[PDB]
Ligand binder design. Structure first.
Ligand SMILES: [Zn+2]
Ligand SMILES: [Zn+2]
Lengths: 365, 361
């Protein structure tokens, strides 16, 4: 009972090793124990690469017979199926943190293992495994990606001065944490308002990671998250930097653009609500394209639109210990809000220190 | 006895904090006397004009004070130094020297054959009387600027609707911070707009604070109203409360006011009250610390004058929008370099809100 926890906690630690590259697949860790000794260890790293169980079963070999397998997720039961691979090695019992997120296939893998005479149990540290792939978990259950809205402002909630200077409000430590969160995200999303105003690259710069992250993230394996730009009126030109970078760029247009763009640029057509791109339908279409999580680098207009649509799953707010004044740019634009009742309400979940700044994690309450 | 000295000292600092609601304008001082590894004397200063902590603790000790060790959170001073020798003491441990007479008391004890040492938990003693220490060294009170706003730094909607942005827990926390402050300062703009009382309501304290603050001992902090143009009338609530009210005027008001109201005349710089000179005059009147309930204009003026020592910011998990009123008006600020700079010291949870403590360094 206590032995299961210790071995399992290794699997979740292993599963987190590939959180930068597993998309659109989840993070899964597998540990195989024979006679109280770890003979098999493996984690999923890349889509189309071997799964964690196959990685760990290869390490075990013959020593996998009658052994105990600890997996952070219920093994695949559809093709080769990881469940059958476990049986082909002679494993006697399997411990899974949680069932499959998909209701269509939830419990199938455990059942097939049990039918062939294997002790099966699920539930151990389920919440910790659920937190590992929050985007993937949400997509399978709802069809919507997990949305993280990033906000960086001074003490008085200001994102830029009246002159427009927004450089170095947050500490260099804060930007760098942003890069770590960018690298774990399946996609990075912005609006044409931000693209036209700042001309950003909005990419993950490997040289800007921490030494801890750099050790578990080889540079030649750098996966640039797909960049999504909301452009209802096709205002972004093919000369902006965001499409001149390495990696993919998805443009959410309401009508097709007639210009010639770089090959890394693609176009997604979203129906229009009122006179603006329908954010709700865009998230649904992105879910159909197997997008797990979205990191949103948005200005005040896009932030308010997502919040008023009820699409934001998590607020990540960086606050610097500086005061900018009342004519400095605000945080989010909420057109229509005139009474205190209509103000958006959230809940403080995690408060952590990032250098001289603080980072507040919030969920939509 | 290095660790043994710490345990007794932390008891003295614990005792000294017991009178932080009533000691003004005197500092908070705690005294513990140990004889043969047993605490025979314990005392803290509670009220101005009451006995000092050494007298408090020496009285309980009695004959048991002889050859004993006294732990005091501040250098001993009728002089407390002479009182200490008159009861007989072999060793004295002080957290810190006097901010001013600094070293005279230890020397006065040392000349009479007493082992004296200072330095134990100096930082902890400094945090006990930040206002009193600063006033003695500089002549200026310690200023705490309170800010309560939404996530986007908004204190009220465009219409002015400000009701219940912060939680009821935050209001109660504010009452505790008000009760420890020597004075509460505001501007005439806030008085004319909200007609506040700006008092400490004992029924709005927490049960922990209420336990250490008997109701009949309630000390109302001095209320300071900045009224450059004497716009506040004698019908506003701020002068209808129990306790004193000090008006920082640029010219004397010709009306008749209640006896609890007094007036301080502050010189004018250009066409504005010199806030710096007002702080100097308030320090000259032995005001240790000031709790500032200010609007955007007054908050910006204090910050641009470099008078704010500590930011206490309450943030609620709500967003008010870009047409909601801001926190501080900083006219002239155009480059990030001239923006006020602070450092997060303490972040704590107050119900659904958070409270961020910041210092000007
Ligand atoms: Zn598998
Ligand atoms: Zn004394």
């Amino acid at each position: 009972h206590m032995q299961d926890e210790m071995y399992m906690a290794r699997a979740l630690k292993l599963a987190a090793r590939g959180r930068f590259t597993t998309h659109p697949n989840p993070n899964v860790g597998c540990v195989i124990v024979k006679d109280g000794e770890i003979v098999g260890e493996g984690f999923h790293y890349r889509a189309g690469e071997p799964h964690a169980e196959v990685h760990a079963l290869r390490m075990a070999g013959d020593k996998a017979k009658g052994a105990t397998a600890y997996v952070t997720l219920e093994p695949c039961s559809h093709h080769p199926p990881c469940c059958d691979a476990l049986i082909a090695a002679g494993v006697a019992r399997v411990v899974a943190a949680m069932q499959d997120p998909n209701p269509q296939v939830a419990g199938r893998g455990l059942y097939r293992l049990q039918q062939a005479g294997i002790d099966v149990s699920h539930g151990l540290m389920m919440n910790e495994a659920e937190a590992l792939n929050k985007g993937f978990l949400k997509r399978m259950r709802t069809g919507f990606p997990w949305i993280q809205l990033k906000m960086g402002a001074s003490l008085d909630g200001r994102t830029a001065m009246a002159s427009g200077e927004s450089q170095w409000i947050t500490s260099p430590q804060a930007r760098r944490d942003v890069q770590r969160l960018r690298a774990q995200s399946h996609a990075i999303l912005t609006s044409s308002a931000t693209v036209l105003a700042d001309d950003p690259a909005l990419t993950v710069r490997w040289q800007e990671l921490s030494a801890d992250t750099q050790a578990l993230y080889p540079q030649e394996n750098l996966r640039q998250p797909l960049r999504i730009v909301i452009d209802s009126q096709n205002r972004v030109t093919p000369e902006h930097r965001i499409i001149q970078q390495q990696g993919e760029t998805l443009f959410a247009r309401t009508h097709a653009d007639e210009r010639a763009w770089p090959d890394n640029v693609r176009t997604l057509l979203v129906p229009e609500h009122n006179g603006h791109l329908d954010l709700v339908l865009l998230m649904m279409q992105l879910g159909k394209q197997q997008v797990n999580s979205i990191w949103v680098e948005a200005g005040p207009t896009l932030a308010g639109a997502l919040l008023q649509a009820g699409l934001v799953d998590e607020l990540i707010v960086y606050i610097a210990p500086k005061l900018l004044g009342s004519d400095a740019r605000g945080l989010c634009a909420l057109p229509g809000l005139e009474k205190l009742s209509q103000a958006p309400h959230f809940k403080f979940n995690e408060i952590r220190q990032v250098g001289p700044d603080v980072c507040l994690h919030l969920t939509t309450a």
